[PDB]
Symmetry: D2
């Protein structure tokens, strides 16, 4: 029958290690580590892509409408974050390479670099990084590197529906947003307004003091910020500046899911939202762990790929790269439990 090595196509996987330093005369030992590490990173990128595309597809073909599929969705998104955790740890292996030893074979790498990784870009795009999110240096050089089939795939990963878009769509349909029905946004606006009013009255009742004038201008801030939730115009504007990415209505669904997460239909949807955030944090921690290491390897030296090196990479560690940055920023609009619109028997049984 079938055999381990053949099953895993190790004729390919373990015959894929060519040390350029060797190829050009003086074999440097640690180059082998350098090569295996990147390869393992790339096997796992492939796997993440496999999970990610499968989940995207579940949204794109409508299967997500059937809630029996949510366990699968969340399991696979959570798997993506478990893999990234491993990927963030994996840097510790390459760190057993001194900059001194790296330097003995680095010259045989130029002009290649990780910038040319097709899979990393597919992953960035499929999650939903937009070109106008990318660092100046990055949004005019990332795609200018690939051709033929590879260019085709990069193109498709920007042209096809991203995780962000697909989640946005499904978030807009979140039960309870319907004005006819539960009218979440209206109640919420009502309760926050009533809530802030009571608060102001409590503060005014206070014995005129140093601490009081503090509470007032502090209250005025919280009122300014909370009420601005309901300013759809401010949202379009923030959208246009790219400080925000989700539609206004999707954002309402997300917050619906936050406040009412313990309702049975919202439990797994809430886990999904948590996973999306986790994936963003891990993606950024990857970038950040990447930066720390490149610093020790290159110092101030420019990259083999022609970027500034340590300084360019440090600018990718930034919320401009957080695809689901909104999901984090909903914590700005957290209110006291009591203000959350109460839930009646019939929308509970729903």
């Amino acid at each position: 029958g079938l055999i381990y090595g053949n099953y895993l196509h190790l004729e390919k996987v373990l015959n894929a290690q060519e040390l350029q330093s060797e190829t050009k005369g003086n074999k440097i030992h640690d180059e082998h580590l350098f090569i295996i590490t990147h390869q393992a990173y790339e096997l796992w990128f492939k796997q993440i892509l496999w999970e990610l595309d499968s989940v995207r597809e579940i949204f794109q073909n409508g299967h997500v409408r059937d809630e029996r599929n949510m366990l699968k969705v969340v399991s696979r998104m959570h798997r993506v974050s478990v893999i990234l955790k491993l990927l963030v740890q994996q840097f510790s292996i390459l760190e057993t390479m001194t900059a001194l030893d790296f330097n003995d074979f680095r010259e045989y790498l130029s002009p290649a670099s990780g910038f040319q990784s097709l899979q990393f870009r597919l992953l960035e795009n499929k999650i939903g990084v937009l070109q106008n999110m990318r660092v100046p240096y990055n949004r005019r050089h990332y795609r200018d590197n690939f051709k033929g089939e590879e260019n085709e795939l990069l193109l498709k990963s920007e042209q096809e529906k991203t995780l962000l878009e697909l989640v946005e769509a499904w978030l807009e349909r979140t039960p309870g947003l319907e004005p006819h029905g539960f009218n979440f946004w209206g109640k919420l606006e009502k309760n926050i307004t009533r809530g802030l009013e009571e608060e102001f009255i409590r503060i005014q009742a206070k014995e005129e003091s140093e601490e009081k004038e503090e509470q007032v201008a502090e209250f005025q801030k919280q009122k300014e910020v909370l009420l601005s939730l309901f300013d759809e115009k401010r949202h379009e504007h923030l959208l246009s500046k790219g400080e925000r990415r989700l539609s206004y209505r999707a954002l309402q669904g997300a917050l619906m899911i936050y406040f009412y997460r313990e309702e049975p239909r919202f439990q797994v949807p809430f886990q999904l939202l948590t996973s999306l955030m986790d994936i963003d944090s891990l993606m950024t921690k990857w970038r950040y762990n990447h930066v720390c290491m490149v610093h020790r390897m290159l110092g101030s030296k420019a990259g083999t790929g022609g970027s500034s090196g340590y300084h360019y990479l440090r600018s990718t560690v930034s919320d401009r790269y957080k695809v689901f940055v909104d999901l984090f920023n909903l914590s700005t609009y957290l209110i006291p439990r009591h203000w959350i619109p109460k839930m009646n028997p019939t929308i509970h049984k729903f």
Copy 2:
């Protein structure tokens, strides 16, 4: 002798007071929040204990007897193993949702991490330079002392200045290097001006001194030479464990920073753009602590800038080769 007593659990496990409970309605997750901070502080105390012992080994002259290097490197390596665990330990508090956090957050004000003594002592003792309003009494004293007593950076500095091979009438490392790099650049020409400007700027002692004042550089010129010496000649028996040490010093900076960052990533989910109870902008202020401003041993990182081809490095004659044996 009994486990509980030995460990003084009568104290350790009776130190958990949920404010939410003290003010009427106990919120479950406050307990997690308390336990996590306590574990962190226990580990801060342990790091302080390793760190002070290493500082003392430099300051009392024992680091001069090289048989103590195994002790030094191990203890420094231990600090980094603890920090590594401390970085991972945020994963526990991340099982608290922002919502649930938001249920007891009100009872915390105005306490915050800003008032953690040990974290401050740790930063000063390593050597973060100031260029405290939260502390007073015996705590304000300790803090002053930790700013005033010699830091890990100063002690390591002194020691690095005494590195074998730097003396000009001896192996004269620094003079040869300048000769070799210069021939090397010239040779390459006949076979650039950017790295040439960059390489040669290493030999500008006064440029160095300038950046020292602005603190964009941190080690003395001499200490910098010693570090470079240990990097290049790291396989020489006397340089092996010292080189491990330099590596650890850099390990500790990355871990410190990874800590600040993991902290930031979690505070971002907890607060969004809410101000911190301690009065910082929150997310944004902590974001600014993730910069080489706080990287005490930047120089060791930045020495990677000046790496050269092996051939250029001043070959070591048997005089000094033998000098560098145990």
Copy 3:
């Protein structure tokens, strides 16, 4: 106004470090590491017990009947396993202590040992480690050397309903089992009998002779599932823990995990197995460290790393009865 140090009762937490080597006249540096390491473990044991008891109570008081509470239940159990992961990794810190240095203060410890950790014992008990299944130490019972208040506390933790019993009871009410309802078990036996017969008929059509014994073993194993007396017997030998009906609920939740009412239940079951693996991995890392430090004792430890201490063995063993997807009784 509230201050960090006071809030955290740091006046206690950070004043709880007495090096016995120092108290006896020669401070040995690494005893500090030894003391801090244990205090952190115990701090996390207290947290685990805190989560663990709130969850037992959610079960014991009936709240778990309201399925809105499952997210909270599963989050806390998952959180227990996240702490346990850190605790497993935490041995790496103590592994920076050499056996030679450990040897310089070991004498000052005696007769204290980990055997005396009140919290480690409460944890074992509250999850559901059975006493009559405990490997005896020094020909005696784990509770013997505890006394007074602590002894009572352990008694209570032995007698009070454990996680295992609480989950068991909830598993017995799993929707689907009822004979006059979806009749899960009845249908399962029928579908397994049909599957096997179809399987047998195909094999008729040396490498053939393998499948025959291979089938015969599987036939015997699968059909043994519907033998309740064999179950009851293995129960009493402590080789199974869950009642027969509870088992049915667990297999119900495995097979139909994607059904929305079963999604978070399935996560919980997975968490319970997680907690079992993490406890065992904790005991193993312990063992591996002792070996290097010290060279019963190390023997008793190595003997705890076994399915004797695996409170939810039944959940692992269900994997034995996995069947092809299309044998699973369909849902109307």
Copy 4:
């Protein structure tokens, strides 16, 4: 005409190596992809470990280890190996996100392949120094050849052993470590006994007498070479008597500059034994959850077989662990 990332790493090979048997045989099962990637990633890291380990064997085999400027390279690489194994132990957490139920949906397509047929895992076991008694029909052709070479060539065990046998300080007319250690331990015991002969008759004194006699037998058994030879023949010890002395010398005097890095080396070798068994163990915990008591595709009983690989039988460097049986109070260590 320009080195490119994908060419350099030959991803034309690495990322075209994923063929789901379930897909090949008519119904694709999503999670098989994970099973495959997980295994390929382990094998890339096995290859990397082989690479490090062979280079270190060669520094011993060709004598470069005699020149102590190379010890930093030796320890760094051995340490690198345990860093890789730490990651490989952690990597199970990824496969653990596959439920047994989903695994069950494609398991049938794997028979009769198994990890028993992992060439590299066996090469690894062998080059470290796992003995064939302390335990390959699954192999053929060139692979079977490599396997045999890995059995006959010097293992890291034998190479480390020879080097231990040359540890400075052992020589009888020199520092005479062994003779001094035996003399000092004998005096130390005699004295401590006298101290016990002083104590007033009690149940306590009797417990110290009984304790003493137990220590005394263990410590003095160290200077019994014939006992060591017997145990060696049973395979309960692996190192020669002299290598044993050399390791103890390095333990006791580890802070002496010439012994600092060697000490680090001995620690790494123990690390690597520890991590291998942790690997074997996390593998066991996972396989349990997938199979229960079902027999493996490779033909073993599965969960139950793998459990028996988790034992100091497979610890190549047991002697290094067990030397801590013979720790003595610092006063007794012969001075310099």
